[PDB]
Ligand binder design. Structure first.
Ligand SMILES: CCCCCCCCCCCCCCCCCC(=O)OC[C@H](CO[C@@H]1O[C@H](CO)[C@H](O)[C@H](O)[C@H]1O)OC(=O)CCCCCCCCCCCCCCCCC
Ligand SMILES: CCCCCCCCCCCCCCCCCC(=O)O[C@@H](COC(=O)CCCCCCCCCCCCCCC)COP(=O)(O)OC[C@H](O)CO
Ligand code: SF4
Ligand code: SF4
Ligand code: SF4
Lengths: 371, 202, 19, 95, 163, 158, 141, 165
């Protein structure tokens, strides 16, 4: 049964369930997964090398190409690395706008996780159902930033521009409509017998294993661990708003689904609280804002590590400056790249049709796994 | 001078009713059912997903996404093609049955885009790999622009004649020699996390 | 340059139950 | 304070100088271990084709280094030692 | 033993109820109007800051080449020569290739003379790649607004909220 | 100033070297490669539950290769967790650093990345192979003196 | 004057009744090939008459230039590309059969093809399925 | 309006003889087609059946069509900062294709897609192009319509008064 009985199938870059170009070399013993080997790097564009030999104002368009669903989180980490290195303060209005945009991107990322997840389970209608409201999120972003995705809105020491006239009421109406949409999603999906029986007892992860494997976000929080980097690191203005860290005790994929739904609801609450108490004053820092040759931000000569709570987990930047415009070292800590390495342990001794459910439980997009 | 040259060919055919209307109806049928490959690689595929969704509908043009290459007419290349992925992309294109059409969507598929300058693994355009009919500029092109590119592809498809069929079959020239290289087995054998606890080796 | 610090510290577990 | 006494520790070449790399010195250098090719591989011929251009110069703890990028090659520049480079006369490249 | 059959009964009716609930939730969308924008017979009006095809003013360009340096890929090509009579930079050619352009907005933001602007002109698809190398004449063409095309229904995303 | 972890190590007689702090004040320690496999277990024993990130970088072209580990604690009821940066330096000619996969499993992919980009070989890693680059590639791309060998599909789209 | 290009690349003796075979379990999962729009180098025996590819014959390198015709090829130009391919294969003696070596060989072969196109040896194939000029538009000198 | 509007816009109509007669009489023709496209190939197909060879020209990146089409024109290939600025010279497109056509070809047809973006004078030149080059026919999509209708391009460009159809 060691060989000539074990079928090695390359469920590779071109597969509907493979989010992007992830490859799995799966060894099956009659629809039973003996093991699987993940092959990644089919989207490796060498972005860490392009991070050098590029100024920050030049590298900012490159930033949104990892985690292209939650682009504002990558933009936030890229603009808050060097602004922490240079001790640049952020005005309160810019911080509130950043919090609102980050929570909207978290909502959109959780939506476009729920879509492919239920598609891999077998339901195709929820994909269109999430897209009906992700188009509204795109409309808000295009009204504010100027584009649906790849916004190029976050800037060092502030944002690109202030919110346009008539944006607060539009976002509030979106929140009011999206709460109803989320209730419809939970009515359609959450108790469905086929969905439960496909999801209820797959991918049980212990809390100790989740800590040791380096998991973060909804993966780590779905093992009995209340670990959110928004409340641990006191990021931006998250200490001023009333919100709860969504965590569940059981380790299965249903806990992850419930966590992401609750995170969407808590995010909506955060947008509502932030828009209710928006401050005034400037948004761009007037100190840094100053035909003549224009230099870029010269990074100081010290190392730095900055973290953010991306919807997929913890997104980090390890930055080493060289007293020049180009950073000496720019290492990206991707949440999906570290959450993916637990997949062979989970899918071992499981079944072939369960691989789709396990991989949809993990928020993996291949543009962020490799760089 | 990189000049161009027309080869020697014969007269076409000329027909009154049967062949001409049959060709026109075949062209019209291949217009309205350009089934995409569901080939997604990178961020542009998200906008491709936005063209499967409700706000902009794939179904109005037909254009139902089919996973298998054998059931796909159009490959809509969305995403950067790395060195690790380009042979897979060319296989997928080759495995698609004739007639087949390619749309290069995104700046990374036309010329490499942002990665045209410093990326050490990004293929600068799939025109180096597959023959592209319609080029679609833009980083995440708007879904309406994708529909416009598909409309232009339809404009070119409806212009086809029977002669274009013999423009599509490969010439298939080959040349075989011995290489005296070193033959080695595959590094990725599929063995992963099996008997891992016995692999410590202090 | 410098030197590798804590080269057994020359006391370490000075009296008491050793770690 | 300055690093030594001038603002820069003075370098062998100027920025924008067109340089050409030694074959033998590069091959026995430590930096060639980054590529790891055998001696008969033909991927690095354009290195010796007098196409390189110096963008920056820096005195690392391992010596003087120049960040050279070759004209017509859309790849990342490389830090190479100044001893293995020659300052040349003309660009010697046409697209 | 009977309690097992009773529990099987109550855990079967629940599944039927939730299947019917999914059916009802999905079929309640048949009474709702479609959200589909029927392109190309209907076009969505772009935002006031949508980043599309570049518009270039030849008279206002000074060939300062800061738009090249602000570009992530140094894409714009500014061929210029010095007019020795006045010692000012005379522009000869300006070209942006839209096959490599990502429409980031750095050129239109860091241009000191503000001669570079973003239009609403998307849908720049061409059959040939090298036809995307727009020179200073193609860039200078005024964009075609969808509000001026009266064969389509221009769709507004949200109420104007200008009251 | 001596950090908490450095004071604990000098109390327990473990050799190391303190390189200072980052901009946030997190301690940075240098561990010799020969002692790193023994010191990682002691680091977990201290209470560092979470291997936040494993990274490698070039100190200087033609110079040392440094491997970086970020560690913190995940525990109930701790307000400010303790985070430490630790760097292990290996020569360029033959870089060899022991793997911490048998202490923290999170290094499993990450060290492979450090092998794929910089060529730092990890000893006790059971599946050390290229992860991002093609598996038949020759060369380490992220080293500062790497040169791309003129592939046709990388050149300009003519 | 004279004959010129007198090397006259000699292919291996043609086999008969060759049937298509997949790669074995141990050797499968890898590309052992370099494919690109103008060049396909396969560690296999491919015959053109019946379109059969035997991938178990790893001791043979089959070169297919221009499958989707973008250039007009004469027999002399084919012989030039084939003698260059033979010289490149003999130059890389001792290298592994990995994808990296074959991709390098294809890269030099395509650089040779572009040099031939720009020198006037070959011209772009009109009456092709597409007209995109992947090696550059017609330009004057 | 209805009745005739809602009645068959089928593609079996006998307008093709009139279409060929118009494209032979009026050398430059403006064409209007369905928005979703694909109903133009029925009319271009018969032109290609007569031996005409098509040159597809996009009017968005045309760039002053006089020197782009009828003259040798300078174009700068896009450097990405790795190369110095190079000035290439390209042959006149329509004349290069004309002199390179086989002797049995009836001629060249210039298919100008998206010609609405051109100005008035560019359309004037595109209409007057067949006068300078005898064996060139000009087809330019100047818009979209529910049904395929064509007009002389000189009438649209303003050389001839726009007679009511
Ligand atoms: C039209 C009918 C559409 C619904 C039929 C699909 C199948 C179905 O009901 O499976 C959906 C579930 C699958 O239910 C599973 O299989 C068994 C069925 O009793 C056992 O109950 C299992 O424990 C339960 O998990 O079927 C039911 O529970 C019966 C529902 C009957 C609906 C009528
Ligand atoms: C497993 C099979 C499918 C089960 C579920 C089917 C979906 C049920 C309907 C869900 C959408 C409700 C839409 C409400 C419309 C409001 C306006 C209206 O006409 O309401 C009437 C509802 O009108 C309808 O009948 C709705 C259409 C149902 C038939 C179409 C679906 C067929 C499947 C009210 O009358 P009633 O509820 O008493 O009618 C039902 C009763 O049995 C009649 O005697
Ligand atoms: S245009 Fe290129 S870089 Fe931008 S999202 Fe698409 S594939 Fe990625
Ligand atoms: S920044 Fe503006 S003015 Fe300066 S060269 Fe560019 S386009 Fe011309
Ligand atoms: S829009 Fe951005 S990518 Fe395009 S030319 Fe301007 S700066 Fe360059």
């Amino acid at each position: 049964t060691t060989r000539k009985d074990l079928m090695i199938v390359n469920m590779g870059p071109h597969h509907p369930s493979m989010h992007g170009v992830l490859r799995l070399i799966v060894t099956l013993d009659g629809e039973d997964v003996i093991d699987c080997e993940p092959i990644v790097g089919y989207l490796h564009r060498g972005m860490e090398k392009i991070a050098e030999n590029r100024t920050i104002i030049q590298y900012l368009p490159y930033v949104t190409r990892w985690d292209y669903l939650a682009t504002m989180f990558t933009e936030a980490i890229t603009v808050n690395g060097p602004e922490q290195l240079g001790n640049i303060q952020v005005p309160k209005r810019a911080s509130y706008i950043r919090v609102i945009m980050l929570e909207l991107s978290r909502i959109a990322s959780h939506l476009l996780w729920l879509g492919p997840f239920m598609a891999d389970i077998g339901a195709q209608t929820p994909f269109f159902y999430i897209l009906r409201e992700r188009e509204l999120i795109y409309d808000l972003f295009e009204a504010a930033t100027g584009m649906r995705m790849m916004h190029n809105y976050f800037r060092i020491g502030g944002v690109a521009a202030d919110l346009p006239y008539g944006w607060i009421d539009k976002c509030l109406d979106f929140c009011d409509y999206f709460l109803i949409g989320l209730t419809e999603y939970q009515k359609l999906i959450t108790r469905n017998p086929i969905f439960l029986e496909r999801v209820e007892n797959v991918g049980i992860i212990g809390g100790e294993e989740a800590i040791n494997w380096g998991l973060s976000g909804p993966m780590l929080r779905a093992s009995g661990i209340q670990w959110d980097l928004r409340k641990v690191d006191h990021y931006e203005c998250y200490d001023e708003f009333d919100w709860e860290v969504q965590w569940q005790k059981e380790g299965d994929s249903l806990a992850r689904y419930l966590i992401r739904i609750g995170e969407m609801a808590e995010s909506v609450k955060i947008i509502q609280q932030a828009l209710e108490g928006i401050p005034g004053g400037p948004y761009e820092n007037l100190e840094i804002r100053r035909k003549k040759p224009s230099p870029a931000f010269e990074l100081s000569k010290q190392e730095l590590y900055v973290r953010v709570e991306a919807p997929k987990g913890e997104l980090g930047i390890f930055l080493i400056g060289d007293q020049s415009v180009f950073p000496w070292r720019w290492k990206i800590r991707p949440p999906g790249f570290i959450n993916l390495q637990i997949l062979p342990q989970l899918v071992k001794k499981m079944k072939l049709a369960d691989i789709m459910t396990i991989l949809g439980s993990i928020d993996i997009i291949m543009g962020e796994v490799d760089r | 001078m990189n000049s161009i040259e027309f080869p020697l060919l014969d007269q076409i055919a000329q027909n009154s009713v049967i062949s001409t209307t049959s060709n026109d109806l075949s062209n019209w049928s291949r217009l309205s059912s350009l089934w995409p490959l569901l080939y997604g690689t990178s961020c542009c595929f998200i906008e491709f997903a936005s063209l499967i969704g409700s706000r902009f509908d794939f179904d109005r043009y037909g254009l139902v996404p089919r996973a298998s290459p054998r059931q796909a007419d159009l490959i809509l290349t969305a995403g950067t093609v790395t060195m690790k992925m380009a042979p897979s992309l060319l296989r997928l294109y080759e495995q698609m049955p004739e007639p087949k059409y390619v749309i290069a969507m995104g700046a990374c598929t036309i010329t490499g885009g942002m990665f045209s300058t410093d990326s050490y693994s990004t293929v600068r355009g799939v025109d180096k790999l597959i023959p592209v009919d319609v080029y679609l500029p833009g980083c995440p092109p708007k879904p309406e622009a994708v529909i416009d590119a598909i409309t232009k592809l339809r404009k070119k498809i409806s212009r086809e004649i029977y002669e274009d069929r013999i423009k599509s079959q490969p010439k298939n020239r080959c040349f075989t020699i011995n290489h005296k290289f070193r033959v080695g087995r595959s590094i990725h054998t599929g063995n992963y996390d099996q008997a891992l606890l016995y692999k410590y080796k202090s | 340059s410098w030197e590798g610090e804590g080269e057994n510290s020359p006391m370490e577990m000075p009296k008491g139950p050793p770690s | 304070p300055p690093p030594k006494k001038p603002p820069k520790p003075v370098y062998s070449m100027k920025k924008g100088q067109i340089v050409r790399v030694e074959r033998e010195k590069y091959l026995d250098s430590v930096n060639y271990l980054s590529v790891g090719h055998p001696k008969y591989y033909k991927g690095l011929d354009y290195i010796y084709e007098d196409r390189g251009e110096v963008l920056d110069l820096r005195f690392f703890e391992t010596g003087e280094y120049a960040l050279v990028s070759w004209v017509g090659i859309p790849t990342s520049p490389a830090w190479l030692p100044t001893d293995m480079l020659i300052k040349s006369d003309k660009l010697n490249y046409e697209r | 033993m009977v309690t097992g059959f009773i529990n099987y009964g109550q855990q079967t009716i629940r599944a039927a109820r939730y299947i019917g609930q999914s059916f009802m939730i999905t079929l309640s969308h048949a009474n709702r109007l479609p959200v589909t924008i029927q392109y190309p017979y209907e076009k969505l009006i772009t935002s006031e800051r949508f980043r599309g095809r570049i518009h270039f003013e030849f008279d206002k360009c000074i060939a300062c080449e800061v738009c090249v340096r602000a570009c992530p890929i140094d894409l714009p090509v500014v061929d210029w020569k010095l007019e020795t009579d006045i010692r000012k930079k005379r522009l000869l050619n300006y070209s942006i290739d839209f096959g490599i352009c990502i429409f980031c907005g750095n050129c239109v933001e860091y241009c000191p003379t503000n001669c570079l602007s973003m239009t609403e002109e998307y849908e720049l698809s061409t059959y040939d790649r090298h036809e995307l190398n727009y020179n200073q004449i193609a860039l200078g063409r005024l964009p075609i607004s969808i509000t001026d095309d009266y064969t389509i229904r221009t769709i507004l995303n949200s109420p104007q909220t200008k009251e | 100033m001596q950090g908490r972890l450095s004071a604990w190590l000098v109390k327990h007689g473990l050799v190391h070297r303190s390189l200072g702090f980052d901009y946030q004040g997190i301690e940075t320690l240098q561990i010799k490669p020969e002692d790193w496999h023994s010191i990682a277990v002691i680091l977990y024993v201290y209470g560092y539950n979470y291997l936040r990130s494993q990274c490698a970088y070039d100190v200087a072209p033609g110079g040392l290769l440094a491997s970086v580990y970020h560690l913190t604690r995940i525990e109930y009821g701790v307000d400010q967790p303790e985070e430490v940066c630790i760097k292990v330096f290996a020569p360029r000619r033959n870089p060899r650093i022991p793997s911490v996969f048998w202490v923290w499993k999170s290094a499993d992919f990450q060290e492979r990345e450090s092998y794929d980009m910089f060529g730092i070989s990890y000893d006790n890693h059971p599946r050390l192979k290229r992860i991002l680059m093609p598996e038949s590639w020759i060369g380490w791309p992220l080293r500062k003196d790497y040169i791309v060998p003129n592939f046709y599909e990388i050149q300009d789209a003519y | 004057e004279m004959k010129e290009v007198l090397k006259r690349a000699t292919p291996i003796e043609a086999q008969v009744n060759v049937k298509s075979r997949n790669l074995e379990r141990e050797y499968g999962g890898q590309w052992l090939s370099s494919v690109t729009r103008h060049v396909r180098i396969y560690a296999a025996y491919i015959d053109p008459v019946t379109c059969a590819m035997d991938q178990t014959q790893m001791d043979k390198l089959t070169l297919m230039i221009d499958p989707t015709d973008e250039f007009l090829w004469n027999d002399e130009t084919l012989n030039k590309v084939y003698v260059y391919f033979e010289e490149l294969v003999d130059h890389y003696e001792g290298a592994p059969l990995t994808e990296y070596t074959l991709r390098l060989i294809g890269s030099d072969i395509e650089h040779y093809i572009r040099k031939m196109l720009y020198e006037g040896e070959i011209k772009y194939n009109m009456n092709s399925r597409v007209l995109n000029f992947s090696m550059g538009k017609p330009r004057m000198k | 309006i209805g009745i005739r509007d809602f009645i068959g816009g089928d593609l079996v109509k006998f307008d093709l003889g009139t279409w060929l007669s118009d494209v032979e009489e009026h050398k430059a023709i403006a064409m209007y087609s369905p928005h979703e496209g694909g109903y133009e190939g029925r009319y271009l197909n018969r032109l290609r059946y007569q031996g005409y060879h098509f040159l597809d020209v996009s009017a968005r990146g045309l760039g002053d069509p006089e020197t782009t089409l009828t003259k040798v024109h300078p174009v700068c290939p896009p450097h990405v900062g790795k190369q110095p600025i190079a000035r290439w010279w390209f042959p006149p497109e329509v004349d290069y294709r004309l002199e390179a056509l086989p002797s049995d070809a009836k001629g060249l047809v210039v298919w100008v897609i998206e010609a609405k973006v051109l100005s008035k004078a560019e359309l004037q030149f595109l209409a007057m192009l067949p006068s300078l080059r005898p064996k060139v026919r000009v087809i330019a999509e100047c818009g979209n319509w529910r049904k395929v209708m064509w007009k002389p391009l000189k009438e649209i460009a303003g050389l001839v008064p726009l007679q009511e159809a």
